[PDB]
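Before the break, one more example. Copy the sequence into your notebook; we will annotate it together after we see the structure.
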Amino acid sequence: GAMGPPRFIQVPENMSIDEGRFCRMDFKVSGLPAPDVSWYLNGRTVQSDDLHKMIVSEKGLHSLIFEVVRASDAGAYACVAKNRAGEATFTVQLDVLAKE
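Here is what the structure looks like once it is written out:
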């Protein structure tokens, strides 16, 4: 039937995580058709990998995971969601608590 752009629903708060733990971020996302999504940190891009996993449910929930976080991963993360009808953009901070 009808379709439309991605929009805001819910974003995570500024996290603070002990060095070497598992952690995750979870962004609710609602647009039709299902948007393409890209990621950033401090003004440059972030690709996915085996420790930096990226998945999105058809139920409208995008997840961004850290298998083993390190002090160099700290900063302002962002992402952008795009479909044929429009664009939306989201931001969060990560304060990685070192153990030196």
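The beta strands are 4-7, 23-28, 30-32, 36-41, 44-46, 54-57, 61-66, 75-83, 86-94. The radius of gyration is 14 Å. Try to locate both features in your own notes.
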